[PDB]
Amino acid sequence: LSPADKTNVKAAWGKVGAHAGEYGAEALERMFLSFPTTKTYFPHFDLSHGSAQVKGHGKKVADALTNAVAHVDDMPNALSALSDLHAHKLRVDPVNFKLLSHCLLVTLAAHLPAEFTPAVHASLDKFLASVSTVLTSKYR
Amino acid sequence: LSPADKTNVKAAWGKVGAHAGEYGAEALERMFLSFPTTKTYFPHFDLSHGSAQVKGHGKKVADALTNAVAHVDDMPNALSALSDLHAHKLRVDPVNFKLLSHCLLVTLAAHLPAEFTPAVHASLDKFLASVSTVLTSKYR
Amino acid sequence: MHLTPEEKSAVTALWGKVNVDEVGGEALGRLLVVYPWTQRFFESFGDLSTPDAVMGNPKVKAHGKKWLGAFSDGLAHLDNLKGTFATLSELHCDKLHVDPENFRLLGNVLVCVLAHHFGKEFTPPVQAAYQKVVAGVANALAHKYH
Amino acid sequence: MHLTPEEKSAVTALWGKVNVDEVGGEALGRLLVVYPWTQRFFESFGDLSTPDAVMGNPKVKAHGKKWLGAFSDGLAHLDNLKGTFATLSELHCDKLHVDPENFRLLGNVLVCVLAHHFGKEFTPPVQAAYQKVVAGVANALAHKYH
Ligand code: HEM
Ligand code: HEM
Ligand code: HEM
Numbered sequence A, B: 001l002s003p004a005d006k007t008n009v010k011a012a013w014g015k016v017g018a019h020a021g022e023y024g025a026e027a028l029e030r031m032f033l034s035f036p037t038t039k040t041y042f043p044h045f046d047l048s049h050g051s052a053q054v055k056g057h058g059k060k061v062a063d064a065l066t067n068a069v070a071h072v073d074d075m076p077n078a079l080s081a082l083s084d085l086h087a088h089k090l091r092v093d094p095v096n097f098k099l100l101s102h103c104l105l106v107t108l109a110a111h112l113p114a115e116f117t118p119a120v121h122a123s124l125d126k127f128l129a130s131v132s133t134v135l136t137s138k139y140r
Numbered sequence C, D: 001m002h003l004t005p006e007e008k009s010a011v012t013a014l015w016g017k018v019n020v021d022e023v024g025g026e027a028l029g030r031l032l033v034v035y036p037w038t039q040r041f042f043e044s045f046g047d048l049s050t051p052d053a054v055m056g057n058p059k060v061k062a063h064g065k066k067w068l069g070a071f072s073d074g075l076a077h078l079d080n081l082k083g084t085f086a087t088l089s090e091l092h093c094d095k096l097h098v099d100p101e102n103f104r105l106l107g108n109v110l111v112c113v114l115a116h117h118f119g120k121e122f123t124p125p126v127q128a129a130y131q132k133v134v135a136g137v138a139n140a141l142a143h144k145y146h
């Protein structure tokens, strides 16, 4: 992530403000509907629209991303605990992280008409890819 | 790559010995036949079996890998020039590196009956993944 | 491709609101900016060094109307995408040498553009329907690669 | 799936030399070792901490014969893989919750095993034919996911 990418990310994520958790749930819903195979990881969840479990999980995901933004110059350490968790317990196949990243970009695009410029779009894609790389770094 | 991965890689690649170039051409042939879409990057090559262009390219690929093994504790710098080349000129889509890696593992499996143990298989897969990551690190 | 009546109507309805020219250029431009390596097929388009340069390039806009126009006529034949794009598939493979993976990347960028353009109207169910369509088109375009 | 007569005979011929029990356990074991996260579906198999532990585990071997046996009967129906695996597809989705990506990983490991087992006889053309088969089987198994 170039310094410019770091600036666009913080600007865009700032605008998200308190809507983060809500955007996190929307992205999950978008993922479950567009890519049905991702549902295999949540057989224990009520995956109906407006589900409390989805909203709750949505906020956890959103909170982690917010933590990543605040520590973009040191994500591996900032997400160390989550990296261990997905690698040793959850064990979600790596391919799935690109599906959620895509749904998160779609969600941001739908809510940030003015901030989602081609440049910002590019920086956010790199940012989520970096996050996904960190979360799967301890798999093998 | 754990130190153990580094040991398995060097042991396996040592056995390859002078056959490296020849194995590199076989892997390319295996790739072009199994995954036809990869041919879109070599419209300027005679891709018929035993082609001089394929054998020649096979050795270059093999030589680079040998360089990566000899400098596994510093691949980014060791492959800096190739990283720039694929990122700025060749511009091969990242997905394609997993296809070649797979064909290289198949090639090694077919030639190293005794050395291709489950453990070695695992270390070689991680090694090629690391190589692919280095070669695409400068794309964006 | 098989789409439920619901998904069918959802796609058709939203597309009636699409400015083919603008959306096509927008999507192609974002492709070139977000995934720079796709620029390998457009060296003859000129200056593509910056986002501004890419989005304001006349050749990008012209081509924009071109591919999306073909994409558009495709929505009128959802029952037979393979048959509808057979010729274009042969063209992108034998003459243009375009890696099929690119069709998928463009399909996703198109989805981002639609969401950016329509906002809340691009609901999760609407997105799901379009993800099926673009995947269907990408597969139809890669069908004759050999 | 559509295979040329050449690819058909190549697959059939090599498979007559396969020890279903051994190959099945070998492939499943290498899957668990090379892609550790796939172990999430086999917590009830016991000790899978080391390669040796994985390759010498009785439950892995038993299951090995099981899936490859089904895979084997599938080769007798290359003209209709979807129809042949419909029930198993529903099972892996609704009851087992297996991410379809896993079928592709297992398909590639299977190819590595065959090459390791047959050496030079596993020629590039033979591999290409088998890559088509495993991809066809993986798609047939993911067909009823919803
Ligand atoms: C940007 C990527 C992602 C981030 C930042 C992320 C973050 C998190 C966080 C913070 C938790 C909460 C853990 C806890 O309860 O302590 C979690 C749980 C989990 N994640 Fe990830 N995750 C990501 C991607 C994925 C993907 C791609 C999937 C699979 C499709 C996934 C599946 C899960 C599951 C199933 C859980 C546990 C759910 C439960 O509590 O029952 N995650 N993730
Ligand atoms: C382990 C991964 C790979 C390695 C180590 C590698 C290495 C190399 C090397 C050393 C060259 C020679 C450059 C020169 O002539 O100075 C090269 C060229 C090239 N590579 Fe990569 N490469 C890899 C993967 C790929 C893949 C996946 C493709 C595409 C399917 C690809 C396509 C090309 C092309 C088309 C050229 C130029 C061929 C020519 O000279 O006409 N490479 N690569
Ligand atoms: C669903 C998506 C796509 C559709 C429907 C499509 C459609 C078309 C059409 C209608 C043409 C004009 C053919 C002619 O010159 O007679 C064309 C040309 C071309 N397409 Fe595609 N295309 C798609 C995606 C792509 C992608 C992703 C790339 C690569 C990044 C690409 C690269 C090209 C190039 C380089 C040409 C030649 C342009 C020229 O000669 O002026 N296309 N495409």
Ligand code: HEM
Pocket (backbone or CB within 6 Å): D038, D041, D042, D066, D067, D068, D070, D071, D088, D091, D092, D096, D098, D102, D103, D106, D137, D138, D141
């Ligand atoms: C082409 C590949 C595959 C085939 C043909 C296949 C076939 C089968 C068959 C025949 C069964 C037995 C069903 C029954 O209990 O009645 C089964 C069970 C199962 N499969 Fe698959 N399978 C495949 C791949 C996978 C993969 C990659 C995984 C996940 C890593 C997986 C995980 C399971 C599990 C956990 C069971 C249940 C075992 C038990 O209850 O003892 N399968 N599979």
